[PDB]
Structure formats: C-alpha cells, structure tokens
Symmetry: D2
Subunit: 106 residues, 4 copies
C-alpha cells in the first residue's frame, strides 16, 4: 500500500482497539497496525521528498515507525497473555507516537 | 520484493557488517537489513502456506522479524554514536536470530 | 534508597528534562532516572504488600519499570547522538508511563 | 547484593532455564535474573574502580545490563504465553550478552 492508505489502516485499527470487547479484537487490530507500519517503512513523506534515504532525516522518520512497532509489540504480548485492558491502555502511548511523527513530518 | 530477495539482502549486508572497517559502512548495511526485514514482514514462507495469517505460527514468524529489527535498532544507535566495534559485534547476535527462524520455518 | 526516595529522583529529573538546554542536562537527568528505576525494581509498594514477588501483580508492577527504563534507554541514545530536542520530547511519553503505574499501584 | 552475588544469581538461573522442563521454573529463573541485573545496575566493576560513575565507560557498562534485561523481558513474555521452548532458546542469546560484557569489563 502507499503511505496514505497505511495511515488509514493505522487510524482505523487504533479506533478498533479503543472500543474492543475482547482479546481477539485487540490482537487483530494490533497485528493489522504492525503490518501497516512495516509496509510504510520505506515511504518518503511529501515534506521529506528532497532528502536522501541515507540522510539523518529519513533515519529519524523510520525511527518513528520502529517506536510505534515496538509499542505494538509489547501491547500484543499483553493481549496474548489475556491482559486486554492493559493492552487497550497502550493506545494512549501509541497515539503520542502518531502525534510526534505527524508534528515533525506531516 | 519477495521473501527470497529480502533474504539475499539480509545475507549480503550481514557479511558487509562482519567485514566492515568504518561506521558509515556498518550504518548503511544495518539500514538495508531493516528495510528488507520490514518488507518481508507480511510474507508467508513456503512451510507456513497452510497456516492462517492469525495463526500462532504466523505471529511467531513475524515475531522473529521484530527481534531482528530490534537488534538492528540498537546496533544502529551504537554505530551512530561512534561505537563501531560494538555495532560490529552485534552481528554475532543478529546471526543467532537468523538461525532460530530458519531452524523453525525455512 | 527506598521507593519514595527513588520516586522523588524520577520526579525531579523528569522536570529537569522538560526545562533543559544542552545534551548534558538531559543526559544527566536520564542517567539518574535509570539508576533510580533500577534501584526501585524490587520494591514492594504499599498496595501490593499482600502479594508475593512471584504473583502476577508483582510482575505487572515490575513490568512498568521495564517500560520506563526502555524509554529512558532510547532517549539516552538520542541525547548521545546530539538529538537533544528529540530526547527532551521523550519526557511526554515517560510521564505516561509514570501515570499508568500510578493509576494501578499508587 | 554485591556484583559477585548478582553474577552468581545470573549464572545459576541461566543454567536453570537451560535445564528446565516446565514453564514455572523458566518464569521464576527469568524473574530472578532481571532482579539481579537491576541490582547490579549501579555496581562499579574492579577494572573500572578508578573511574567516575559518570564516565563513558560506566555508561557503556550499564548499557550491557539494559541489553540483558530487555532480552529477559521478551523471554518472560514468551514463557508467560506458554512458549517454553522459545523462551529457553533465548538463553543462547543471553549468553552472548554475558560474554560481550565480560570481554570488555571483567
Ligand atoms: C512517521 C514516522 C509517522 C507515524 C509514526 C505515523 N504517521 Fe500518520 N502520517 C505520517 C505522514 C508523513 C503523514 C502525511 C501523509 C501525506 O501524504 O502527506 C501521515 C498521515 C496520516 C493520516 C492522514 C490524515 C490526514 O492528515 O488527512 C492519518 C489518518 C494518520 N496519519 C494516522 C496515523 C495514526 C493513527 C498513527 C499512529 C497509530 C500514525 N498516523 C503514525 C507519518 C506518520
Ligand atoms: C524469519 C523470521 C526469518 C528471519 C529472522 C531470517 N530469515 Fe532467512 N529465511 C527465512 C525463510 C522462511 C526462508 C526460506 C524462504 C524460501 O522461500 O524458501 C529464508 C531463507 C534465507 C536464505 C536463502 C534465500 C533463498 O534464496 O532461498 C538466506 C541466504 C537467508 N534466509 C539469510 C538470512 C539472514 C542472513 C538472516 C539474518 C540476518 C535471516 N535470513 C533472517 C526466514 C527468516
Ligand atoms: C510502577 C511501576 C511505577 C512507576 C513506573 C513510577 N512510579 Fe511513581 N510511584 C509508584 C508507587 C507505588 C508509588 C507510591 C509509593 C508509596 O510508598 O506510597 C509512587 C509514588 C510516586 C511519587 C510520590 C512519592 C511520595 O513521596 O509519596 C512521586 C512524586 C512519583 N511516584 C513520581 C514518579 C515519576 C515522575 C515517575 C516517572 C518518571 C514514576 N513515579 C514512575 C509506582 C511507580
Ligand atoms: C556487564 C554489563 C556484565 C553482564 C551483562 C554480565 N556480567 Fe558477569 N560479570 C561482570 C563483571 C564485571 C564481572 C567480574 C566481577 C568481579 O568482581 O570480579 C562478572 C563476573 C561474573 C561471574 C564470576 C563471579 C565471581 O564471583 O567471580 C560470573 C559467574 C558471571 N559474571 C556470570 C554472568 C552471566 C551468566 C551473565 C549473563 C546472564 C553475566 N555474568 C552478565 C559483568 C557482567
Ligand atoms: Zn512487556
Ligand atoms: Zn542501546
Ligand atoms: Zn531508538
Ligand atoms: Zn516479543
């Protein structure tokens, strides 16, 4: 997918997590978010179109996806263990990761 | 890229790190490895073609890529900081992650 | 130090980071926070005195320190790469970890 | 506990994980290891006795404990999920972390 459609997938499943009823719903939403972030890994965002893929700025951009995926990784372990509510609370932390990359690069 | 091509990229660049003599070369190889792993994230390997994408096996498959990318992540900070020899030694750990996934799913 | 002492050290240095210039003020605050969190690792907080250190609740308690230390860990790499602004911005996510533990166990 | 006691705790419990036939012994051993590593956090090893707790060598020393605790963190999630064989294969990776610190600072 392109960067914009992966972002739609991130947003849709972030919402699913916040309103989920059970561990299966949380795990499915987290898995979909991680695959969307991994697929967006090599995207160049519009405001960085002039930057080398080997530059400090593009490493910072990808670093934002590493943070997001790492956060999803931990939440998914929690949901695998049945700590659904703790997994759901990880959405508050994820949201900041969204905001931070958006405020620098969107 | 397909799974086999991402693996060639992982293989080529792990050997680069093992033979490298400067920080820029290690950083460049680490970034290529991470992009290949992120691109391989949603691949289904031949031995899991019968498995549901939500199966435990496919989560465990993707989990091996998270481990690898996480190791690359820390090594890339060490390389960014000048600790070239430490970043280079992280290839010994990287290799164990290669072996573990291969033993299970290759 | 006891838990209350380490919490003050976290609180003071969390404020130092938000109100800092230069990698030095930030690095030094992060280093002290990591040492305080590590020293707190095995503390039994009042609301869990009836739980054994093998209980699920005590694992969930320590797990909140792992999240905190992992965030400090990444912030310190950023500060050591000269990314003082990005390091200072970790303070927002750190505070969320403070609050998530407090809401359950303080 | 002093550094020698925390190292004995790590050595004993790494062997427990290797020999283990059940999840409970793995989880218990990993918990003991994490506590030992957290307690060793602010130790000064003999070869750095003359240096500052703030020295770059001492940051680099502590960094080895973060690597170890992060690896224990993931293996404990796997043990908690009943993936006992996968948690035990994490011991191979832990050992390299033991060796990497010993080669530099023991
Ligand atoms: C960088 C590392 C990012 C992270 C992490 C997240 N997003 Fe993002 N997103 C990013 C950019 C550069 C853009 C701009 C796209 C463009 O073509 O200019 C976006 C865009 C979105 C959108 C589109 C909405 C709009 O502004 O019209 C959405 C809905 C969105 N992003 C959601 C989202 C969520 C929920 C995230 C975290 C879970 C998230 N994004 C992370 C870069 C990055
Ligand atoms: C799972 C999570 C894996 C990780 C981590 C790594 N590899 Fe891998 N590799 C994996 C599979 C399932 C396969 C088989 C793919 C197929 O279609 O048969 C492979 C294969 C390879 C190969 C051979 C590629 C080919 O042309 O057939 C190589 C050279 C290879 N892998 C290298 C490699 C390295 C160096 C890794 C770590 C840095 C690594 N792989 C990780 C699954 C997984
Ligand atoms: C659990 C994993 C915690 C994390 C992470 C943080 N804190 Fe905490 N804090 C915790 C407990 C159980 C308590 C109660 C201690 C008691 O004996 O009652 C506290 C308390 C505090 C306090 C008040 C200390 C006092 O004098 O009573 C402060 C100022 C405080 N905590 C700050 C703080 C900050 C800034 C944190 C993040 C950087 C943080 N705590 C994390 C448990 C946990
Ligand atoms: C640095 C960050 C280290 C990590 C990670 C591990 N160890 Fe270690 N170890 C370290 C030092 C500096 C020393 C010497 C301490 C001294 O005062 O001599 C050690 C020593 C040991 C020992 C011998 C203890 C003794 O009484 O002589 C053992 C058995 C040992 N270490 C085991 C061990 C294991 C199994 C580790 C990984 C799980 C490990 N150590 C990590 C520094 C560091
Ligand atoms: Zn966790
Ligand atoms: Zn690190
Ligand atoms: Zn980082
Ligand atoms: Zn994991």
């Amino acid at each position: 997918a392109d960067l914009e459609d992966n972002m739609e997938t991130l947003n849709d499943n972030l919402k699913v997590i916040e309103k989920a009823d059970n561990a299966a719903q949380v795990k499915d939403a987290l898995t979909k978010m991680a695959a969307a972030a991994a697929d967006a890994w090599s995207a160049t965002p519009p405001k960085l179109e002039d930057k080398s893929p080997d530059s400090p700025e593009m490493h910072d951009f990808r670093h934002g996806f590493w943070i997001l995926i790492g956060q999803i990784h931990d939440a998914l372990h929690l949901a695998n263990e049945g700590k659904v509510k703790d997994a759901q609370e990880a959405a508050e932390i994820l949201k900041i990761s969204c905001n931070h990359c958006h405020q620098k690069y969107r």
